[PDB]
Design goal:
This is Putative exported protein. InterPro entries: BUG (IPR005064), Bug_dom1 (IPR042100). By secondary structure, the chain is α/β, with parallel strands linked by helices. The protein folds into two domains: 167 residues, no CATH class; 124 residues, no CATH class. 38% of the residues lie in helices and 20% in strands. The protein is built from ten helices and ten strands. Strands 1, 2, 3, 4, 5, 6, 7, 8, 9 and 10 form a ten-stranded mixed sheet that branches.
């Protein structure tokens, strides 16, 4: 019985790399092999649906960022499955979002940026990867927490947005840390804040938003494993224990750090609470801003 893990995003990105690094460590346990299948489309809904439908024996699993687990059903009018019915296994890792600005912007930190945005109401421009994306929703969270108003400029993905931020065609981007990190290290962008409960290992000198007085401003790309509805608890538990064991291995922790990723390996109970908490949080953000 081979373990099939569907990643509903292309090969070669973070969503693909993390479950692959982990699955490399699981080989001895899964003699019939561990197979990562990439199935792109519809915000992860295409791959997600294939797992949702599969036999709930724990040998078909979805390894995904949040979209098809906790977010999409708040964005998409109708979908082929109900995300609230996923059986949680684990969270492999978290990659925090950050507030990044063009260095000519005359702000040094979050409070200064907040003040700039309020003195220049409706004028500061933020890029995103498109409506409903993590960058769009993170910006929306920030604005609802701070009562700032900023102009949305949607891009086809991260690279066009990052190019415009570097060039100065937009003022700000709520990027994932690994995208912006090397630009910040070369002083070519300025990361003001990390939207997480603790600082990032990859950027020890940049404070969190909590430490800059905005403690509710947490926004991370979490990579979870979930099983089809009705997968038995004992199988779920055995799988999570296996994933947690791999995340211990130094080589896995190093390859995760290389992506800006903090390993988690949370137990099924913790994982479920977190997902349910995230669904609620992001629905609340989407309603206050629209889809």
């Amino acid at each position: 019985q081979a373990l099939k893990i569907i990643v509903p995003y292309p090969a070669g990105g973070t969503a693909d790399i993390l479950p692959r690094v982990v699955a490399e460590k699981l080989r001895a346990q899964f003699p019939a092999g561990v197979l990562i299948d990439n199935r792109t489309g519809a915000g992860g809904n295409i791959g997600a649906e294939a797992v949702f439908r599969a036999e709930p024996d724990g040998n078909t699993l979805l390894a995904s960022p949040p979209g098809p687990i906790a977010i999409n059903h708040h964005l998409y009018r109708k979908m082929a499955f109900d995300p609230s019915k996923w059986e949680p296994v684990t969270v492999l890792a978290t990659v925090p979002n950050v507030l990044v600005v063009n260095p000519r912007l005359p702000v040094k930190n979050v409070q200064e940026f907040i003040a700039y945005a309020k003195a220049n109401p409706g004028k500061v421009t933020y890029g995103s990867q498109g409506n409903g994306t993590t960058s769009h929703l993170t910006a929306s969270l920030f604005m609802q927490l701070t009562g700032t108003e900023m102009v949305h400029v949607p891009y086809k993905g991260t690279a066009p947005a990052l190019v415009d931020l570097v060039g100065g065609q937009i003022d700000v981007f709520f990027d994932n840390i690994s995208s912006s990190l090397p630009f910040h290290q070369a002083g070519k962008l300025r990361i003001l804040g990390v939207a997480d409960e603790q600082r990032s290992a990859a950027l020890p000198e940049v404070p969190t938003f909590a430490e800059q007085g905005l403690p509710s401003m947490n926004a991370v790309t979490w990579f979870a494993v979930v099983a089809p509805p009705g997968t038995p608890a004992a199988k779920v538990a055995a799988l999570q224990k296996s994933f947690a064991g791999a995340l211990t291995q130094p080589e896995v922790q190093q390859k995760f750090a290389e992506q800006g990723a903090e390993p988690r390996g949370w137990d099924p109970a913790r994982t479920g609470q977190f997902i349910r908490a995230e669904s609620a949080k992001w629905d609340r953000v989407i309603r206050s801003a629209n889809v």
